[PDB]
């Protein structure tokens, strides 16, 4: 029935740890990190130009130059000194930066029958084939190459390539007329020609009423075929400040959490002394060591974060009018968030090693151990046909549908079909003959294996009890 | 009693109105046009001049936007501020400041938000403060706060001329500036084709980042007669309200002969409450109509003055909420009266072992939903709108279980994690139901 | 085993009858009736004017006149090619160059009285007019405006030989104030200008109809269009439409002349099935009414009789319409009555065919193929009735509660029947919860969560009840 | 356990064959084939004109001329940079600055005859001509208009060297009235103006095709575009398109001199599988046609031989086309035929690879009885056949009822098979209830409710039936032993 497990002490000293780990993850999260993202997205991605071109609807180089000299400068510069306050409250930090990565002039040698019409060839992007020589007037910082170490920066796994960190850049000047002059001079000479492979626009803003950084990066990729593909990443960073009451409380509970993880690691290595073998038998110990690992890396990132933020702010006010790299911080703070949520999930479900509820959390393992060697041979049979269908759907559709454009996309598309999220008209317009067949036969296969697994476990139970009763 | 319960249910299932929907819809459609395109307080004036004045004074003298809806009195524009505490950060990045959350404005300024002169009082200006008691008492519950009932108040109405006069006088003098929190536009309307009195509030409130959120709040009340709703409705209601008094007398003579144990039986707590609620409903209905009449007594004395019908609408909302409870109690009582006079036990006592399955299965549920809600809120709560908070996430995960919400954006955002979380959910539920099958088939065999 | 019931002499006869009615009902449906409706509705319901007012987004009376002037005469009257060279066929308008416009369009209006209700006692010297909601007894029947023409005097439903109409609020009568539009487009523009200057649409107006018809001869089909705009007593406007593609003339080519043989054999089959069903009741006097497969035979016979009657009714009516169209043009021809009843005839034919298939299911038998659940609910038929009543009383309580809490702000809850169907749809996984969460911030989530838990509870109970039955005894 | 059968060597050679065909299939699919189609299809279908007419919103014969003279010539002919600086390579259109326009675009048209109808006598005095719906028998072959050019006279299918085409209403022929658009944008504007002035789209027109093709050399790919507009007998237009990205030129690279080494292996593996599937016939003279693995082992061999045969034809025809393009430019090169058949070849290859993947259970099969089910195929031989022909009767009755009630209003019920798939999708929780409720707000709800109740009923019936049957037989098989 319902009864505390294995002692009364560990349960209370764990329901203390659970309560303490829930407040450390709600002292990092703000409730105005969704309004902020929503508003900055509405400002920079939806605002149309004359000719009505938003960033989300850029489809050529002309559209890029229309968005850049129109709504970008209009959205980055407000007034009512020598500073910008977007919407009067969000201060712009430093200078926005345009960056471009190109590809070499002779990379993908042309066929035999076309080399009298087409003379030079530009491959797809790859760090091997890349252009590093000056072009245009060969004069400024936007017409010469600076490697990834000079421009201290990191790769970006955006779309199709995972672009590098160097390239040809331009830091926009202070006022609006100066930036307009710079961009017009950048356009009059062909800054974007057949060699251009990607363009980034990076900047960041800081709001002080709520305490937040909004870090914006807009990417536009120019494939080897023409046109553009735009993408964006908008992230938010906290910057906690240590004066208030609540913040002193949070510092205290930080110390408590560190003490707790020390206690738990010493207890695990203390009971490893007892019964060395069989210690790998229980899954709960695996959960404990997983939580320990995640907690120590959590505190690691928590100190590194403060290091880098003080460094950034120092460089930022010591010499403004330059570019302050907030992108590294945003990326890794997001990864830290994604990790802390998982750690919280595990800490929450680790209470079934404790106060127990009967007729479910007693025989799920009793049935799982019985329902094995008949389901491992049922998963090797399901995934063969699952991946066969994945390849069939990648090869039938996938030049027309985006959800089938690659292999992993097909995998998750089939998963979503199982969950009940499909767009049947897309599959049906792609192929009017094999679209329906693919759909129908896939659904039937899934339901078939489901009910066969069900019947297998039912007959297993039957036989088991029949041999256990009348034996 | 059969007649008593059937009369009660037909008196709760009746009293519906098909016009309160269409009135609200017409008004909302007309006044909410281009309202959400207001980001800053610099835009409020083109919107006011373009799609607020043509609708408040609609080409029939007295009515809003097509005839059909009379305008009752002046139109109020109210605003609550934060004190102008000169910030101008500039060189203020080291040791960044903390703006206070204990600040409201309660002082009397004088034209241009400057110090006032040696007549320290509380005059009726657009710059002096107005108490909530002095004003129509009505704390408004906006979207990200619960603003007060006071503030800085102007009234511009009953023509199109005076409206534009004061709308160009407010802008020229900078009445609305950066120290402005929520703003409210309030008016009242009466429709005599389908007797209905509606109150409209338009709320423009300030978020953190300098930008505004927009909302509308409409509240309607039908002042018919409470008695001239026609024949065949007064007779059923009068016999029902006589039987309510009969049952009140029954329970009274039951309590006097008991002096105690009256609260120990379910058949007594379920009828006395019904009697009390049925009385209070008609009491509050008569009270609401009286309040409306005596507030119209004020309008007939001097129009061109603002009037708030908030008390009547609030007691009417009380009347409305006291009907869900009447319905709930009636359902429970009918179900019991039926399970008694027909042996219709619902469960074959498989849903209980004397106390445990009750609280030995509503803890699994709470732990699992808290786990998944907290994780989904921390992972996706910064972009997706259905996971903004903990309770939003609770409702959204319950919807996922039912099927009304789909995993299309949580897979489009975090495929690698969102896929494994759904997989964990499915495996857990499948194991649960397989256990429910095997234990069942093993019980009836041993 | 699927042994055959009553002798093969019966099964083969019924198979012949079944394929006969299938040929009948599928020879009279055309492959190009969806595209006809598509293009016509897209031309009249989606084309916007300058200022971008299409019929679907009419929201005032000024919007109505905007649509009626610009993108209603531009679509109705076609007299040039796209290179502004005139078509040859004169005095007629061929929409899309193929669809002949029959007769003359008609505008109709239903008004209400200036004093249909009494104003409240308080607002009796401030409000001087009361316009009730639409009802046939509160209906203005006096002239207004210039009080002279046909658009300013009242015409009864028997003068305007016409019928009802079930809109989105009520059912409207068949008379009122009307105007027929003339031949050319400029004459129609001037007529509409005259209707708008002298104020035809005031607050007494409750509903406006625009009726016209079109015939395509390439395919052999009619399209009858009726555009309706409703002006509720609460303010606002609600547009709707009925666009019916029908086949009224149905003997043109050889494929149609083949169908007359199928119709004759259909009549003789009905004669056979009515003489046969009486020799089945001449024997079993009132034991005949025990078999359920006998109510279905009576229903099929009745429906076939009704169809045979409507056949000759439609023939006579279309002859009359064509005659009056040819002899006196420039007049409105009431094609909407015949179109409505032809559509209902098609619906009835569909239902009759659906029942013919079930009768075939009756002729052959299977020993026990889906009698497994019927057996269990014939054995355990007491507790399931308790669960049925306990589910239904709570279901209706929840529907009424959802009507109370929401239903002024959300449409899906604005009516008891809408609440019933919205809950039924929640059960299937189709619901926009953000609406009811905007409507009520506290009781929205409560309503939703408790309803879902109640549904899950009832299903769990039913499953534990029926699977605990297949194991009772051994 | 994993009971590996059939002389494991056979498994180790079939794995080699499988790896070889996966190397041969994925080595000819580009990853940039989707982003080619995406941009070439959003350039020509989503580009509005001054009046706002895209190709997807053509709804008249006047919108066709609004689009054909605006956003079509604008997108076809690229001659300057975005800063009004001329491109270097001249007398050649480089779409998006990378994609070379091959040959000349072609406009083709098919019209219908004048007296292809009867005008039933009630209207015989108002309506004089009747044009039928499209069908090859009822087709105009006379000249019209000025009656002299190539756009006003008829050319048969053998003369144009054309082929059929499956549209949304019917399947059109290959001949018709055509006009090639050579040269600059100014030379094409005049030709299109000439076609508009003297009416080229009149009451007889039934379909219009626009064909062209571009080639990209950065990634060795072709995009063939065919934009179709169908003018039904009712009036209006229906626009559709086929945009095909294909790799017709195989080897230009270093990887491709290796994949040929793969394919010659393929052509001998086939010879190893056809030389052994005849030995079994020699040993099992007619018992060879017993299992179905010997039936899949025939389909896969056949599909492989067909692929080997198509390779040669593709090579020869691409050589012919590339020669014609070079020897006489300013004329239309028919790339649509090859693009269609290359796409069909890709489809057949994908199906063959799927069958080769699922043919792995013939070699390495586990031991859950047969598939942990045949236990239910004991009393299924008389029960499942009775359960299917009783569910499909009611299913198709509902399908017909839904096609006859809705189907002039809702599109998902336009045809019979559309209702079939629509109901199949209703079972999976994917429905649009408002369309059904608007089409008929009395029989719509009835249809919906009764249908979902019917499917829920048969689901519950099947479930409890199978559990009850397996219980009964396990019980009696326990009882029989004691
Ligand atoms: C490629 O670009 C370079 C620029 O560094 C130029 O010098 C060279 O001539 C170009 N090659 C060709 C074949 O145009
Ligand atoms: C740019 O070119 C100018 C001459 O036009 C030269 O003096 C200068 O050194 C170059 N580099 C710069 C400005 O960084
Ligand atoms: C207000 O709107 C009217 C009509 O839109 C216009 O005539 C008037 O100039 C506007 N007022 C201002 C201050 O723009
Ligand atoms: C405007 O309203 C004021 C009072 O609200 C009144 O004194 C004045 O006469 C009105 N003007 C007109 C033109 O009606
Ligand atoms: C339309 O046709 C008329 C006469 O055929 C001509 O005068 C006019 O220029 C044409 N074009 C228009 C009105 O745009
Ligand atoms: C209402 O309409 C009637 C119609 O004849 C008219 O006589 C009357 O003057 C109107 N106004 C009032 C206030 O009754
Ligand atoms: C109304 O009809 C009468 C009857 O002939 C006529 O005298 C009068 O001129 C008409 N008025 C208008 C505006 O047409
Ligand atoms: C476009 O290019 C032409 C070609 O010489 C030029 O005359 C014109 O000024 C350009 N227009 C621009 C750049 O706006
Ligand atoms: C009908 O078609 C014939 C066949 O060419 C043609 O000669 C005749 O002129 C056409 N009639 C009309 C009215 O276009
Ligand atoms: C036009 O027609 C005439 C005779 O019908 C023919 O001789 C000529 O070649 C045609 N083409 C022209 C004039 O371009
Ligand atoms: Ca923290
Ligand atoms: Ca441990
Ligand atoms: Ca789902
Ligand atoms: Ca009978
Ligand atoms: Ca074989």
Numbering used by the authors:
A (entry chain D): 94 to 173, 183 to 573
B (entry chain A): 1664 to 2109
C (entry chain C): 94 to 567
D (entry chain B): 94 to 575
Sentences from the paper on this structure:
The PKD1L3/2L1 complex forms a calcium-permeable, nonselective cation channel, with the permeability preference of PCa:PNa:PMg at ~11:1:0.310,12,30,31. The recombinantly expressed complex can be activated upon washout of the applied acid solution.
The Ca2+ is coordinated by the C = O groups of Leu2063, Gly2066, and Ser2068 in PKD1L3, and by the C = O of Leu521 and Gly522 as well as the carboxylate of Asp523 in PKD2L1-III (right). The distance between the C = O groups and the Ca2+ ion ranges between 2.9 and 5.9 Å, indicating a partially hydrated state of the bound ion. Upon addition of Ca2+, Lys2069 swings upwards, resulting in an enlarged outer mouth with altered electrostatic potential distribution. While the Lys switch in the SF may respond to Ca2+ loading spontaneously, a cascade of conformational changes may lead to pore opening upon Ca2+ binding to the extracellular site in VSDIII.
